[PDB]
Amino acid sequence: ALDPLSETKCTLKSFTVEKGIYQTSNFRVQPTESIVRFPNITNLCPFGEVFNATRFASVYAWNRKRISNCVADYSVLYNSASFSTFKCYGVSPTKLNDLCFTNVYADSFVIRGDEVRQIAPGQTGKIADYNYKLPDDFTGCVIAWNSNNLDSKVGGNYNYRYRLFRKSNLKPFERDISTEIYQAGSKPCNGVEGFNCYFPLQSYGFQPTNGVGYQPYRVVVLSFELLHAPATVCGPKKSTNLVKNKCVNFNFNGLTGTGVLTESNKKFLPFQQFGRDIADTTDAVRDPQTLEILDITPCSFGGVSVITPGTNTSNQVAVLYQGVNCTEVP
Amino acid sequence: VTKFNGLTVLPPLLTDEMIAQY
Amino acid sequence: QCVNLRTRTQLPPAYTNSFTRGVYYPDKVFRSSVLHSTQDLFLPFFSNVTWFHAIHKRFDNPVLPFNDGVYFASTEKSNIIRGWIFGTTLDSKTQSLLIVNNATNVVIKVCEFQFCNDPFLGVYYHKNNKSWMESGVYSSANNCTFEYVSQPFLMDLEGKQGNFKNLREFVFKNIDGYFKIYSKHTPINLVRDLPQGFSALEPLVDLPIGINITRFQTLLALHRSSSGWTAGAAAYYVGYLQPRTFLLKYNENGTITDAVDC
C-alpha cells in the first residue's frame, strides 16, 4: 500500500518485475451523501377527537372511534409533556413511530385516582371485574390525564355513574350500558330492591375539593391490532434536500441505488413512477414531492494499469486509469 | 455493418485510420 | 322490497366477437422503443363476449360469476347504467361492495348492505332542483371498515340520437387483496356493437380492501312518478380473463402501440 511499483509485486508474487503493463486493482468513486426522498404527509388523522376532547362519558358507556386509512403521528404524543401517566409493556413508543398496523382503537372515560391499577390484564376488584376489562395479549399503550379543572363541578357531578357490582366475570372489551340487578342468594330480585340485591350504579361525587382518589382522571386506552388484511395506517417520515451531479445514495419509496442525478429530456406518463432499460436497469426516477424526473447515471469506475520498465534499469512507473476522467481522480 | 454491472469495453490498439494506411 | 319488477324479462345468452381490445398496462414502469413480454391476466384475442341489450320493458340484469375477472364496455349516451356492485352471497352475512355516482362524486362504500331480491338504484324527488342528481339499493349498513372518496366526474341524461361516438371500457381484477380499475374514453364511428382498433387502458382506482368476490350485479337508473319504476335501455358486454402470454410494443413517448398474442 505504498508504491504502485510495489503494488505490482504483490499481484505477481515476485521481487523482480520485467517490462510490460499490468493491472493491479480497480478504481471506484465512493459515495459522499445519502439522499432520502419520500412523498408528503398529507391526509392527516383526527387525533384531537379523543385526546383533546371536550365531551366524555362514564366507565361503562365508553364510545369507540375507528382509526384507519390515515397517518399515525406519535411524535407529538410521546413528547406531549402535558399528561399524567404514560406506561406500557414490551414495545417502547419511541420506535413505534415508523411502523404500520391494521386497526387502531381509542376510548374515552374518566376513572378515579385510586382505581388506576385496575386498568391492566390480570387485575381484579371494582372496575376491572364489573365494568370493563382488557385481554392478556394487549400490546397497546395507555394514556391518562388529570381533569381537575375540566370535568369537575361544584356541588357534585351526578350526571355520570359507575358500577359497583355485576353478575359474573365479563368478557374483555365489553360495552355494557344496561342496568341489570345483582343477585347474591336464592332470592331473585325481580327488577326491584329486595333481599341479597345491591344497586351497582353509584353516582359520582366529583368536586374541586376532592381527594386524590376522588378526582376526575381522564384515561384513554389505546390498542393495536395486527390482522391478515394489508396494513392501512402508518407512521410519518422525514426527507432531506436534493443534491445533483454527485454520486450519492438513493432512498426512494420503492427504490435504492447509487449514482448521480442530472436533468432528463424524457417524458413520463402520470400513471408510472420510474423507468427501466432493456436489461432491467433503472435509468430515470420521479421525485415524489415535485413533478420532475431525474436521470440516473452511475459514477465512474474502471481498472488501474501500471506501465513500468524492468526493475534492473529504473523504478519510475506510470499509472493509467482506464475510462476514468482525471477531474475525478484527485 | 450496424455497461452497468462491472462491464467495460476496451478500445483496440490499431485504430481504423492506421488500418487504412496499411 | 321482495316483489319482482314489472319489466323484469330474461334473455338467452347471445354472443358476439371482440377483435383486438382488452389489453392494459401491466406495471408502472416507463419504457421506450422496446418489445417487452409479460404473463398476466388478459383478454384472449378473437374470443367471445356476452352481448346484453335492454330497452326502455326489458330489465336485462342477470347475475354472473367473477372467478377471474370480467371486462366491461358500457357504451351508452343518456347514461342509464350508473355503477356496479360485487359480493359473495348478496346478503348481510358477509361484506359486499357498492360503487355508485351522483353527478358530483363517485361513492365507494363497502359494508354489510341488506339488498333487495332484485336490487335497483331508485331515483325520486322529481319536483324541483333536479340537476340530474341521484335521489336505494340498500336498507341498512353496520359493522364495516372502509370507505373511499375519489376524483369527481361529469354526466348528462338527455336523449341522444344517431350512432355511438364514445367508448367506456372497464376491467377489474382481485389479486393480493387489492382492487384495480382500468378505463379509457375514446371517440368512435361505430356501425356495430364493438369498434375496431387499438387503445390501451390506464389505472385510476386502487383500493386495499381484501375481500373475496364470487358474483356481481349491474345498477341502472330508474325514474318514477319496489315495482313501480320506469327503466331505461342498456348496452354492455361481459367477458372473462385467462392467464395468457402477451407481447407489448412501446414507442419513443412511452405508449402501447401494438400487441401480439402468443
Short mmCIF file of N, CA, C and O in Angstrom, two decimals, chain A residues 66 68-69 103 229-232 266-269 271-278 283-284, chain C residues 25 27-31 34 144-147 176-178 202-204 208 210 253-255:
data_model
loop_
_atom_site.label_atom_id
_atom_site.label_comp_id
_atom_site.label_asym_id
_atom_site.label_seq_id
_atom_site.Cartn_x
_atom_site.Cartn_y
_atom_site.Cartn_z
N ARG A 66 -63.20 4.76 15.09
CA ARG A 66 -62.42 3.96 14.15
C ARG A 66 -61.29 4.80 13.56
O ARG A 66 -61.53 5.90 13.03
N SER A 68 -58.34 4.43 10.81
CA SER A 68 -57.77 3.69 9.69
C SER A 68 -57.68 4.63 8.50
O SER A 68 -58.34 5.67 8.46
N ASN A 69 -56.85 4.23 7.53
CA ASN A 69 -56.60 4.97 6.28
C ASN A 69 -56.10 6.39 6.54
O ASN A 69 -56.52 7.35 5.91
N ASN A 103 -55.50 -1.81 12.44
CA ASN A 103 -56.56 -1.05 13.08
C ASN A 103 -56.08 -0.44 14.38
O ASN A 103 -55.22 -1.01 15.06
N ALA A 229 -55.41 -8.81 6.96
CA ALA A 229 -55.61 -7.79 5.94
C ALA A 229 -54.36 -6.93 5.81
O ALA A 229 -53.58 -6.81 6.77
N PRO A 230 -54.11 -6.35 4.64
CA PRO A 230 -52.94 -5.47 4.48
C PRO A 230 -53.06 -4.20 5.31
O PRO A 230 -54.16 -3.71 5.59
N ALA A 231 -51.90 -3.67 5.69
CA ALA A 231 -51.86 -2.53 6.61
C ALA A 231 -52.27 -1.24 5.90
O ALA A 231 -51.86 -0.98 4.77
N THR A 232 -53.09 -0.45 6.59
CA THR A 232 -53.60 0.80 6.04
C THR A 232 -53.09 2.04 6.75
O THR A 232 -52.91 3.08 6.10
N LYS A 266 -36.61 13.26 -21.16
CA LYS A 266 -37.69 12.33 -21.47
C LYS A 266 -39.04 12.89 -21.01
O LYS A 266 -39.12 13.95 -20.38
N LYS A 267 -40.10 12.16 -21.34
CA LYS A 267 -41.45 12.48 -20.92
C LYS A 267 -42.04 11.25 -20.25
O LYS A 267 -42.00 10.16 -20.82
N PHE A 268 -42.57 11.43 -19.05
CA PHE A 268 -43.18 10.34 -18.30
C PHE A 268 -44.69 10.49 -18.28
O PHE A 268 -45.23 11.60 -18.31
N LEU A 269 -45.37 9.36 -18.22
CA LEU A 269 -46.81 9.40 -18.08
C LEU A 269 -47.19 9.54 -16.61
O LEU A 269 -46.43 9.11 -15.73
N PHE A 271 -49.23 7.85 -14.96
CA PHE A 271 -49.61 6.55 -14.40
C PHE A 271 -48.40 5.64 -14.19
O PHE A 271 -48.56 4.42 -14.15
N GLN A 272 -47.21 6.21 -14.04
CA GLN A 272 -46.00 5.43 -13.84
C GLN A 272 -44.98 6.27 -13.09
O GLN A 272 -44.92 7.49 -13.25
N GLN A 273 -44.18 5.61 -12.26
CA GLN A 273 -43.22 6.30 -11.40
C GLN A 273 -41.83 6.38 -12.03
O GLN A 273 -41.32 7.47 -12.28
N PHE A 274 -41.22 5.23 -12.30
CA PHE A 274 -39.84 5.19 -12.78
C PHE A 274 -39.78 4.48 -14.14
O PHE A 274 -40.78 3.97 -14.65
N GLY A 275 -38.58 4.46 -14.72
CA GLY A 275 -38.36 3.82 -16.00
C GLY A 275 -37.18 2.87 -15.93
O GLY A 275 -36.35 2.93 -15.02
N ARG A 276 -37.12 1.98 -16.93
CA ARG A 276 -36.10 0.95 -16.97
C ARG A 276 -35.58 0.79 -18.39
O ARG A 276 -36.22 1.21 -19.36
N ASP A 277 -34.40 0.19 -18.50
CA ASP A 277 -33.75 -0.04 -19.78
C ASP A 277 -34.15 -1.43 -20.29
O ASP A 277 -35.05 -2.07 -19.75
N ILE A 278 -33.48 -1.91 -21.35
CA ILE A 278 -33.82 -3.21 -21.91
C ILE A 278 -33.23 -4.36 -21.12
O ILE A 278 -33.61 -5.52 -21.35
N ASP A 283 -32.92 3.80 -15.07
CA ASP A 283 -32.24 4.97 -15.61
C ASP A 283 -32.94 6.30 -15.35
O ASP A 283 -32.33 7.34 -15.62
N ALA A 284 -34.16 6.30 -14.83
CA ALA A 284 -34.88 7.54 -14.57
C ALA A 284 -35.87 7.32 -13.44
O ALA A 284 -36.57 6.30 -13.41
N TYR C 25 -51.95 -1.65 -19.28
CA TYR C 25 -50.58 -1.53 -18.80
C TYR C 25 -50.36 -2.50 -17.65
O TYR C 25 -51.07 -2.44 -16.64
N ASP C 27 -47.75 -2.75 -15.57
CA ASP C 27 -46.99 -2.21 -14.45
C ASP C 27 -46.86 -0.70 -14.61
O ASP C 27 -47.34 -0.11 -15.58
N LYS C 28 -46.20 -0.08 -13.63
CA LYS C 28 -45.97 1.36 -13.61
C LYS C 28 -44.53 1.71 -13.98
O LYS C 28 -43.92 2.60 -13.38
N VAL C 29 -43.96 1.00 -14.94
CA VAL C 29 -42.58 1.18 -15.36
C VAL C 29 -42.58 1.79 -16.76
O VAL C 29 -43.23 1.26 -17.67
N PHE C 30 -41.85 2.89 -16.93
CA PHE C 30 -41.75 3.54 -18.22
C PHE C 30 -40.76 2.80 -19.11
O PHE C 30 -39.70 2.37 -18.67
N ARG C 31 -41.13 2.64 -20.38
CA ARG C 31 -40.27 2.01 -21.37
C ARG C 31 -40.29 2.84 -22.64
O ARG C 31 -41.19 3.65 -22.86
N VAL C 34 -39.05 -0.47 -26.93
CA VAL C 34 -38.71 -1.84 -26.56
C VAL C 34 -39.84 -2.76 -27.00
O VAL C 34 -40.91 -2.32 -27.43
N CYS C 144 -68.60 -2.13 9.55
CA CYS C 144 -67.74 -2.08 8.38
C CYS C 144 -66.58 -1.12 8.62
O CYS C 144 -66.55 -0.36 9.60
N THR C 145 -65.61 -1.17 7.71
CA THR C 145 -64.30 -0.55 7.90
C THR C 145 -64.00 0.54 6.89
O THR C 145 -63.65 1.67 7.28
N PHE C 146 -64.11 0.25 5.60
CA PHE C 146 -63.51 1.07 4.55
C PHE C 146 -64.56 1.88 3.80
O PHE C 146 -65.68 1.41 3.57
N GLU C 147 -64.18 3.10 3.42
CA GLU C 147 -64.99 3.96 2.56
C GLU C 147 -64.04 4.87 1.80
O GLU C 147 -63.03 5.31 2.35
N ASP C 176 -54.10 -10.15 -4.46
CA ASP C 176 -53.29 -9.65 -3.34
C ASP C 176 -54.12 -8.76 -2.41
O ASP C 176 -53.61 -7.86 -1.74
N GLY C 177 -55.43 -9.00 -2.34
CA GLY C 177 -56.31 -8.20 -1.51
C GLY C 177 -56.58 -6.80 -2.02
O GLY C 177 -57.09 -5.97 -1.25
N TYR C 178 -56.25 -6.50 -3.27
CA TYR C 178 -56.42 -5.17 -3.84
C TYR C 178 -57.59 -5.16 -4.82
O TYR C 178 -58.30 -6.16 -5.00
N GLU C 202 -55.73 2.63 -18.74
CA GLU C 202 -54.90 3.27 -17.74
C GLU C 202 -55.45 3.05 -16.33
O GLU C 202 -56.67 3.05 -16.14
N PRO C 203 -54.58 2.86 -15.34
CA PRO C 203 -55.07 2.63 -13.97
C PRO C 203 -55.52 3.93 -13.31
O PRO C 203 -54.83 4.94 -13.36
N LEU C 204 -56.69 3.87 -12.68
CA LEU C 204 -57.24 5.02 -11.96
C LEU C 204 -57.43 4.75 -10.48
O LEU C 204 -57.02 5.57 -9.65
N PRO C 208 -57.14 -0.99 -1.12
CA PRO C 208 -56.68 -2.18 -0.37
C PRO C 208 -57.79 -2.79 0.49
O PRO C 208 -57.81 -2.69 1.72
N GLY C 210 -59.28 -6.30 0.43
CA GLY C 210 -59.05 -7.61 0.99
C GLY C 210 -60.28 -8.49 1.08
O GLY C 210 -60.40 -9.28 2.02
N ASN C 253 -42.42 7.79 -27.01
CA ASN C 253 -43.09 8.58 -25.99
C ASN C 253 -43.51 7.75 -24.78
O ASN C 253 -43.73 8.32 -23.71
N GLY C 254 -43.62 6.44 -24.93
CA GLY C 254 -44.00 5.57 -23.84
C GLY C 254 -45.42 5.06 -23.86
O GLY C 254 -45.98 4.80 -22.78
N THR C 255 -46.02 4.90 -25.03
CA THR C 255 -47.39 4.42 -25.16
C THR C 255 -47.40 3.09 -25.90
O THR C 255 -46.55 2.83 -26.76
#
